[PDB]
Nucleic acid binder design. Structure first.
Length: 192
DNA sequence: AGCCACATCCCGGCACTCGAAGTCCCCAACTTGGATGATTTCTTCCAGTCCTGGTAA
């Protein structure tokens, strides 16, 4: 699978597992963690399985060991040493005022508080063209979208069941639900 | 190899600095020569009383 220019790190990895047929939990644990362990023990010890936990700004001190795991993937998938690292969210070296935590992604630093940790929404009008969870949704200051007739990002309660893509890793549909093919200022607010 | 209890750990939060002039440095402190003789040191009288044995002829 090739990465998209605007793709989240977790989206790419989910697609990769699935592309190789590693659809189930047990093989997700396996095709990921056990292979890493058998390369070297450190690539696995630094690598918890749950998806939310995988990104750097969720991590503690042993980041370099997690990076080594990214580097093993870079070899396995015929990559480049920074192909994935250009996508990851890391600890900024810049305080952003009053000792706040701030998070750095290839040139843009966004304060910790604007990261939309829970209830990621989606836009069916773009998902039907290329189905992968995209970046710029994880931002708190971002409702609606550019293009697509505007309107609202279709929000978490799709059908009497809260949605996201991390506690339940499907893109087109989630849990009990279906394939989701379901006021004129926010399109300016959208430009983050 | 998978599941569960318990350790800590770091960010967001909170509170403090705290009134409000300075008061001199340094180096030296004395040598010598002698301390007196001649005499004497008290005497009279007195120094309480009564209670509180065991054992055998």
């Amino acid at each position: 699978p090739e990465p998209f220019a605007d793709e989240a790190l977790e989206s790419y990895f989910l697609r990769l597992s699935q592309e190789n047929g590693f659809e189930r939990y047990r093989i997700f644990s396996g095709s990921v963690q056990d292979w890493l362990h058998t390369t070297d023990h450190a690539a696995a010890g630094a690598f918890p399985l749950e998806l939310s936990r995988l990104n750097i700004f969720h991590a503690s001190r042993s980041s370099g060991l997690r990076v080594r795991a990214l580097q093993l993937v870079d070899r396995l998938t015929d990559g480049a040493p920074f192909r994935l690292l250009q996508l990851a969210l890391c600890h900024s070296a810049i305080s952003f005022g009053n000792h706040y935590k701030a998070v750095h992604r290839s040139g843009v630093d966004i304060p910790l508080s604007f990261i939309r940790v829970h209830q990621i929404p989606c836009c069916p009008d773009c998902l039907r063209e290329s189905a992968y969870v995209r970046q710029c949704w994880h931002f708190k200051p971002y409702v609606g979208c550019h293009r697509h007739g505007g309107r609202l990002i279709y929000s978490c309660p799709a059908c009497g069941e809260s949605l996201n893509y991390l506690a339940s890793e499907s893109i087109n549909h989630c849990q009990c639900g279906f394939d989701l093919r379901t006021p004129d200022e926010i399109q300016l607010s959208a430009l983050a």
